Amino acid sequence: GQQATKHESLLDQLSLKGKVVVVTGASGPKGMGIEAARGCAEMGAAVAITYASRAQGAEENVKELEKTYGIKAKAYKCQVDSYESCEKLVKDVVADFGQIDAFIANAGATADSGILDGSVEAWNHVVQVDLNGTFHCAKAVGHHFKERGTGSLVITASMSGHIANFPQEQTSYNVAKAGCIHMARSLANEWRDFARVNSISPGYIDTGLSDFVPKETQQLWHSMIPMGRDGLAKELKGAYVYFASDASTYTTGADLLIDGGYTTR
Amino acid sequence: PGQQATKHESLLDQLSLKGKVVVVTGASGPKGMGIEAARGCAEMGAAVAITYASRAQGAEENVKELEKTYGIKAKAYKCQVDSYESCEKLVKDVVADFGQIDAFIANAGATADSGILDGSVEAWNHVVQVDLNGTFHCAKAVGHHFKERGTGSLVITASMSGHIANFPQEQTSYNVAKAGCIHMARSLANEWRDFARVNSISPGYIDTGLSDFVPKETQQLWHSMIPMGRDGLAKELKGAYVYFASDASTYTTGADLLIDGGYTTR
Amino acid sequence: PGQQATKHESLLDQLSLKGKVVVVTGASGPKGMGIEAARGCAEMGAAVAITYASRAQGAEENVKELEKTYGIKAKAYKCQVDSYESCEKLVKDVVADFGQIDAFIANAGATADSGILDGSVEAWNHVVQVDLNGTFHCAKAVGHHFKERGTGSLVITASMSGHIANFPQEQTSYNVAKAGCIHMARSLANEWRDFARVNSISPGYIDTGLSDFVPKETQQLWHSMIPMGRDGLAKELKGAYVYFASDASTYTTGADLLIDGGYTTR
Amino acid sequence: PGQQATKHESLLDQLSLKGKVVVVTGASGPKGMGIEAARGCAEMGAAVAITYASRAQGAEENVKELEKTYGIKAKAYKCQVDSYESCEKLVKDVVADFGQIDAFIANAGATADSGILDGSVEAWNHVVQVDLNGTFHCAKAVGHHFKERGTGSLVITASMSGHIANFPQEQTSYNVAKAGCIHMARSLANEWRDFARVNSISPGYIDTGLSDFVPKETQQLWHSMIPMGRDGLAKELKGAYVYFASDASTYTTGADLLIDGGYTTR
Ligand SMILES: NC(=O)c1ccc[n+]([C@@H]2O[C@H](COP(=O)([O-])OP(=O)(O)OC[C@H]3O[C@@H](n4cnc5c(N)ncnc54)[C@H](OP(=O)(O)O)[C@@H]3O)[C@@H](O)[C@H]2O)c1
Ligand SMILES: NC(=O)c1ccc[n+]([C@@H]2O[C@H](COP(=O)([O-])OP(=O)(O)OC[C@H]3O[C@@H](n4cnc5c(N)ncnc54)[C@H](OP(=O)(O)O)[C@@H]3O)[C@@H](O)[C@H]2O)c1
Ligand SMILES: NC(=O)c1ccc[n+]([C@@H]2O[C@H](COP(=O)([O-])OP(=O)(O)OC[C@H]3O[C@@H](n4cnc5c(N)ncnc54)[C@H](OP(=O)(O)O)[C@@H]3O)[C@@H](O)[C@H]2O)c1
Ligand SMILES: NC(=O)c1ccc[n+]([C@@H]2O[C@H](COP(=O)([O-])OP(=O)(O)OC[C@H]3O[C@@H](n4cnc5c(N)ncnc54)[C@H](OP(=O)(O)O)[C@@H]3O)[C@@H](O)[C@H]2O)c1
Ligand code: NA
Ligand code: NA
């Protein structure tokens, strides 16, 4: 198995000084990814972020992390739907930064229909990115964690992995996120001698990812969220740092719902 | 909008499948979940279509046993659930041969034999393609038929591996795929809320032959973890399949039923 | 040491309750889960004991319908599940009158009508005492009998309120009690692993008369939240009670079955 | 009308409890969840009220340590959570002494030592009274205060016993009580949606001294069932208490966090 933190103080437990964190899908301006990276940078991590289509957005984010926190930071192209791209990512980050201590598997894409209206290829694309893309990052980084004897993998899942969203149909997305949640549990057991694995399941977060949804659908959502509002990505940074850091050295195979209370109903 | 309650008051009338057609994928083995679901449905009066992949002879013998024992019409079809074209063809053939499909039991599946670090990417892909995308292919192929008819019941064989992580054998690709299958039933129950019910059954360790690739000493460790202290038998699951497939469950949709001898209570 | 699989192969033999005795608490109303469970079990050939608290007459009417319709031995007993002495007396009287108890359906229950801040401490205690401790009283009372006989099946009526928080009415005491009932079934399934099975059924909104104190605008809002779009009917639940009480489920223990028209899928 | 997101952008500012007051029940022991939660909150700048039942001297030493180590105001109170009057008096006294309560950590609890057949009804009532109703008593007492102020965070120490049945020791009363606490957090998260967050933490086996009565050879069977292969330490949980108590979790409500070395993954 794995050992308890040697730190007594919580600020020592939360510190990421001397550690390297990778955040996939942190190229946008206010997503879960850039906020997780900001939290880790604030705790002193060196941070590697990835992009797929938004190179300029990721380069801007890296310059912001450098300006605000003075950390070692860098952006990488990664298509998580390709295992070869995830393998190269881990190879390049280990080369450039020396090691990877925590890996935040955060990249994902949305669905826009149920299974009968959607084509088989539309199902394949969402499963390839959201489910197999997360498996590709886990396998690629897990080989590194096994050689080092330590590591933390944090998977961004979704409350859609627990419930079926309404009124928009998106079963392919719901199913892939469900697989991600159980992947965290199953890898926590597989990797029990060398690494922790946990998942965070956000509710409706105002990141821009849902901008393709009509306005009037989004006001229905609000009546279903007990808190009555969308979340903000900066309300999730504490959870990412919690799982990536030594504040959670007995936490493995857990899922943390962050959803304004949506799943309580 | 929505679905209606059974008209039947008697439970025996509710459970009857006389006049109805049931498809069971992966029912070619002699003592698997598939043939026992098919037996239970045929006993209630269903016409039954079963599928095989590699066990063509076992499927023909099962069909003959179903017909002679229960007096029903049955037929076996070759189907590779990992191919949508094969699943679409199955639904078309059964609807042509039998006239309709009232219940579909998505039961075909294959096992994993390693965790993700020891396994290749292709070994992962194979298990997900069969167990997760194969269930999706069958769900989509038959759901177009259910939507046209305005009724239907889809029953998915998941696994307790979709809830917990097996020990000591590593099989994460199988665990993840089955977990996807469980939530697929919940999400499709909501998607199809106007015309069909969808539910899953999550068996524990069932003595079907599927686990024969695992040493017997590892199977002795499983028994100490099962509160009932034994493997199940496929004949102990037939009532759940018939429950979901019939009118005994017209308000049950999006449910999962663990049949694991208590394994998940610890 | 653990429990054994059913001897029967055919589903109708597994489902039969000929020669067995079923107790259903709280089956005094004309269309509740309780009387429909008793009808399902009686249809399968069981002798049936039902209980009442305030509705002695309705329980008597039900015994007479059960006997006329199904030709079985039936009898009504007064029982206050909130009193352990009364549950102990129930099991003692039924065993004296019927010879034994094979299946026990712990179904009696009462609602709450506020959250914890608007409610008094007495209001909390009353709901917990009836719904949680009353289920415990029956389980303990009959469990001593199951342990002596080496066999048995306990079926607990929980609620989807044990999984989610109902909206817009506040009823946290009832939610909490029902969540305890659900986990009581998992925990007793493990505790009683050598001699009896325990499972729960979690109904959604069922048109039994129990929510007749709820206004109409509120009930129409519920329907928009139910994917099936309608209240359930108690006759749609009899199949689940019989499944768990009979030998159709000899590998099923520690399971919960949501019967909620899809409500908890969202 | 709902609750709002933190105004802070920096995580350190979000975690800060400067100017806030935290109550931690049952923090009188030397290495329990309570004193580590209290140390975590003191480290972030909170004023801290801790309670004791039997260990008055242990609580006073803890208060002297908190004030010496962290330079904060701290105070010990006697509280019997099984008595509503005591919990109501606790909130009144802390509000009078400190001015307000911003976060309340409902952590006091007691263990069970048998299953329901070996245990008496008294033994069941005692555990439920302390572990379920004691938590309700604190929730009700502080929630009246949270409602008045329009802000607050309630953190409930539940247990993985609220999710699974421990083996080999039988403790169904405790398991059931902890399952009530877990759902109580979800249900109050919704009831209190306009003014306060409610969340639970479910520890696995933590080396606090609470399990010192368990035979040592039973404890090493536990370790074989924990993927991490060891007991936890209370200092590994202080991060989670501070997370829920502070502004680092202003969109997190109705959540449960398992901290169990992976025990429930199997
Ligand atoms: N927003 C919500 O309400 C919500 C709720 C629950 C869960 N989530 C999940 O949170 C995670 C982050 O999403 P977000 O809301 O923060 O919006 P976002 O800022 O747009 O993040 C999406 C990230 O995923 C990357 N991405 C998409 N496809 C990729 C692929 N094939 N390969 C590699 N990277 C890919 C994107 O990169 P590029 O932009 O460079 O192409 C982008 O950086 C996702 O997994 C999402 O499913 C979001
Ligand atoms: N046995 C257990 O302990 C257990 C526990 C939990 C869940 N399950 C699941 O229960 C279901 C039935 O398995 P079983 O235990 O009853 O053993 P089984 O008799 O061998 O059934 C598996 C069926 O799946 C078919 N199959 C495999 N791959 C297929 C593919 N690509 N396309 C179409 N069909 C394919 C097989 O057909 P052919 O033989 O003709 O090739 C076979 O009939 C499976 O989904 C399994 O994951 C089993
Ligand atoms: N209807 C729903 O929507 C719904 C949903 C989920 C769960 N449930 C649960 O289903 C179960 C049956 O309720 P129902 O809907 O079928 O309505 P019901 O017909 O009124 O059944 C309630 C039964 O419980 C008995 N009862 C109440 N308090 C009792 C006590 N202290 N001791 C002994 N018996 C007591 C009642 O006896 P008397 O009438 O003779 O006094 C009555 O027969 C209950 O546990 C309920 O919580 C109902
Ligand atoms: N240790 C574990 O493995 C574990 C696992 C899961 C959950 N938990 C839960 O964690 C919480 C704290 O326990 P712990 O492990 O940290 O051991 P602990 O140090 O002995 O804490 C138990 C605390 O609860 C107080 N207490 C007991 N009965 C009380 C009552 N009727 N009223 C008020 N206070 C009462 C005790 O006060 P006095 O000592 O002053 O009498 C004590 O301070 C408990 O709820 C426990 O159920 C523990
Ligand atoms: Na829900
Ligand atoms: Na478990």
Numbering used by the authors:
A (entry chain B): 3 to 267
B (entry chain A), C (entry chain D), D (entry chain C): 2 to 267
Give the exact sentences the study uses for this entry:
Many protein families have numerous members listed in databases as allergens; however, some allergen database entries, herein called “orphan allergens”, are members of large families of which all other members are not allergens. Three orphan allergens [Cladosporium herbarum aldehyde dehydrogenase (ChALDH), Alternaria alternata ALDH (AaALDH), and C. herbarum mannitol dehydrogenase (ChMDH)] were recombinantly produced and purified for structure characterization and for clinical skin prick testing (SPT) in mold allergic participants. Diffraction quality crystals of ChALDH and ChMDH were obtained, and their X-ray crystal structures were determined by molecular replacement.
ChMDH is also a member of a broadly represented superfamily of multimeric enzymes (i.e., short-chain dehydrogenases/reductases (SDR) superfamily) that catalyzes the oxidation and reduction of various alcohols in multiple organisms. The three-dimensional structure of ChMDH (the third orphan allergen selected for study) in complex with NADP+ was determined at 2.04 Å resolution. ChMDH is a tetrameric protein in the X-ray crystal structure and in size-exclusion chromatographic analysis. In both sequence and three-dimensional structure, the monomeric unit of ChMDH is defined by the Rossmann-fold observed in multiple nicotinamide-dependent enzymes, which is conserved across members of the SDR enzyme superfamily, that includes MDH from various species. Clear electron density for NADP+ in the ChMDH·NADP+ complex was observed and identified the active site in the enzyme. The residues of the nicotinamide cofactor binding site in ChMDH are highly conserved with other SDR family members. As expected, ChMDH showed the highest similarity with other members of the SDR enzyme family, which ranged in amino acid sequence identity from 26 to 45% with 1.1 to 1.7 Å r.m.s.d. for 237–264 Cα-atoms. Although the amino acid sequence of ChMDH shares low sequence identity (~ 30%) with the SDR family members from portobello mushroom, canola, and human, the pairwise structural comparisons between ChMDH and these enzymes underscores the evolutionary conservation of the protein fold in each. Comparison of the surface features of ChMDH and the representative SDRs from portobello mushroom, canola, and human reveals some variation in the electrostatic potentials of the proteins, especially in the oligomerization interfaces, but are similar in their surface hydrophobicity.
